[PDB]
Write a protein that holds these residues in place. Structure first.
Motif, PDB file in Angstrom:
ATOM      1  N   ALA A   1       0.712  -0.938   0.058  1.00  0.00           N
ATOM      2  CA  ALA A   1      -0.035  -0.091  -0.112  1.00  0.00           C
ATOM      3  C   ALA A   1       0.712   1.114   0.186  1.00  0.00           C
ATOM      4  CB  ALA A   1      -0.945   0.062   1.165  1.00  0.00           C
ATOM      5  N   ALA A   2       0.659   2.176  -0.502  1.00  0.00           N
ATOM      6  CA  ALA A   2       1.301   3.424  -1.106  1.00  0.00           C
ATOM      7  C   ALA A   2       1.442   4.245   0.372  1.00  0.00           C
ATOM      8  CB  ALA A   2       0.627   4.475  -2.031  1.00  0.00           C
ATOM      9  N   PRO A   3       2.536   4.672   0.565  1.00  0.00           N
ATOM     10  CA  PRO A   3       2.870   5.321   2.016  1.00  0.00           C
ATOM     11  C   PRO A   3       2.115   6.903   1.931  1.00  0.00           C
ATOM     12  CG  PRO A   3       4.557   4.315   1.222  1.00  0.00           C
ATOM     13  CD  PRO A   3       3.810   4.283   0.077  1.00  0.00           C
ATOM     14  N   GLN A   4       1.866   7.249   2.972  1.00  0.00           N
ATOM     15  CA  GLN A   4       1.313   8.527   3.075  1.00  0.00           C
ATOM     16  C   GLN A   4       2.425   9.610   2.664  1.00  0.00           C
ATOM     17  OE1 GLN A   4      -0.837   8.863   6.873  1.00  0.00           O
ATOM     18  NE2 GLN A   4      -2.463   7.805   6.080  1.00  0.00           N
ATOM     19  N   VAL A   5       2.091  10.576   1.970  1.00  0.00           N
ATOM     20  CA  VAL A   5       3.077  11.738   1.652  1.00  0.00           C
ATOM     21  C   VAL A   5       3.288  12.770   2.672  1.00  0.00           C
ATOM     22  CG1 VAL A   5       3.672  13.232  -0.243  1.00  0.00           C
ATOM     23  CG2 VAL A   5       2.788  10.668  -0.693  1.00  0.00           C
ATOM     24  N   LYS A   6       2.237  13.239   3.166  1.00  0.00           N
ATOM     25  CA  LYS A   6       2.304  14.087   4.167  1.00  0.00           C
ATOM     26  C   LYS A   6       2.542  15.719   4.118  1.00  0.00           C
ATOM     27  CE  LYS A   6       1.722  10.611   7.952  1.00  0.00           C
ATOM     28  NZ  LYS A   6       2.164  10.567   9.352  1.00  0.00           N
ATOM     29  N   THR A   7       3.379  15.998   3.192  1.00  0.00           N
ATOM     30  CA  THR A   7       3.790  17.236   2.948  1.00  0.00           C
ATOM     31  C   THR A   7       2.828  18.420   2.421  1.00  0.00           C
ATOM     32  OG1 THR A   7       4.833  16.880   0.804  1.00  0.00           O
ATOM     33  CG2 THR A   7       6.103  16.167   2.397  1.00  0.00           C
ATOM     34  N   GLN A   8       2.764  19.380   2.822  1.00  0.00           N
ATOM     35  CA  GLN A   8       1.991  20.209   2.217  1.00  0.00           C
ATOM     36  C   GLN A   8       2.259  21.156   1.071  1.00  0.00           C
ATOM     37  OE1 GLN A   8      -1.112  21.471   2.018  1.00  0.00           O
ATOM     38  NE2 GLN A   8      -1.440  21.498   4.184  1.00  0.00           N
TER      39      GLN A   8
END
Ligand SMILES: [Mg+2]
Ligand SMILES: [Zn+2]
Ligand SMILES: [Zn+2]
Length: 299
Positions: free
Chosen positions: A8-15
């Motif tokens: 599963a693709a990881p969360q990127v989180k950066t704004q």
């Protein structure tokens, strides 16, 4: 999973890059984010925590409150001017993003002609300096003489209590490259700065706190600096002040004047600690005011 099922693709989180473009007549305004920082506003506001807590809850907020730190670039055609500069590293690791957001907005520091400082708190002047050098190598910096003479005086640093000395240290370190190079040019109160931009005295938050009034082709944007810190308290009740104010009576008076004038005039305001991009209209609302953020617009 079946053979070679991918994780599963990881969360990127950066704004996204913190800039917001807005036309103002012939001028191009770019709100620039320096980041955010949490503030213990229940403690800092000059009223009982329970009243602050109740106000925050009404707006689905709670302390500590993540507070935006904004600056405003204005391209007038003849001048590129920057109003405030963020904190650099003077106020923790979550700020200092202005330089990256200016670059994302399509400009370089060497293109900035003049920089107007609303007041010399660290989250407005820290962006001026990097590595003991001027971060804006061609800019002339301007601020009110009263702010300069207060924050850039050794005597006031040495009288200040231990937890306030850093404000003076940071102001002196941030302005020093410009002062030494003859590129700090004070003004005294209400002053025409360049065609389309004026300094309007709004003293209180600091001795030389200044509002900058930007106007082109009848379109006005008033950059209020730190006349407000906590939208969820201070629009409903402009009388509530904050410990960061040098003179809280004057600060409340200047905020009330600015809100009343913006409600009457129907023009835009931009403010350093309203949720990014911090730009909107103000209308009267009973005993207080209502902020109306600008509509999202794309050229
Ligand atoms: Mg957070
Ligand atoms: Zn301030
Ligand atoms: Zn501030």
């Amino acid at each position: 999973g079946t053979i070679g099922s991918m994780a599963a693709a990881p969360q990127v989180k950066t704004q996204a890059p913190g800039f917001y473009r807005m036309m103002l007549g012939d001028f191009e305004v770019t709100a620039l984010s320096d980041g955010t920082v949490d503030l213990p506003v229940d403690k800092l506001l000059n009223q009982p925590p329970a009243k602050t807590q109740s106000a925050l809850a009404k707006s689905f907020l709670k302390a500590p409150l993540e507070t935006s730190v904004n600056a405003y670039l204005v391209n007038t055609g003849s001048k590129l001017v920057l109003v405030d500069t963020g904190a650099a590293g003077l106020f923790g690791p979550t700020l200092g993003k202005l330089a990256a957001n200016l670059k994302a907005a399509g400009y370089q520091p060497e293109q900035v002609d003049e920089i107007y400082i609303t007041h010399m708190h660290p989250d407005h002047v820290g962006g001026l300096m990097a590595n003991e050098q001027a971060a804006f190598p061609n800019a002339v910096v301007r601020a009110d003489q009263k702010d300069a003479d207060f924050w850039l005086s050794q005597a006031n640093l040495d009288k200040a209590p231990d937890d306030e000395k850093g404000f003076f240290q940071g102001a002196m370190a941030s302005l020093n490259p410009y002062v030494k190079a003859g590129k700090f040019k004070p003004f005294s109160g209400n002053t025409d700065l360049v065609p389309g931009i004026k300094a309007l005295a709004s003293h209180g938050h600091t001795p030389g706190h200044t509002t900058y009034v930007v106007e082109s082709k009848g379109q006005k944007l008033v950059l209020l600096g730190d006349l407000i810190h906590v939208a969820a308290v201070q629009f409903d009740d402009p009388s509530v002040t904050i410990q960061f104010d040098s003179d809280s009576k004057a600060a409340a008076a200047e905020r009330k004047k600015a809100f009343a004038d913006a409600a009457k005039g129907g023009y835009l305001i931009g403010a350093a600690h309203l949720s990014f991009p911090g730009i909107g209209h103000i209308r009267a609302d009973g005993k207080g005011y209502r902020f109306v953020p600008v509509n999202y617009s794309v050229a």
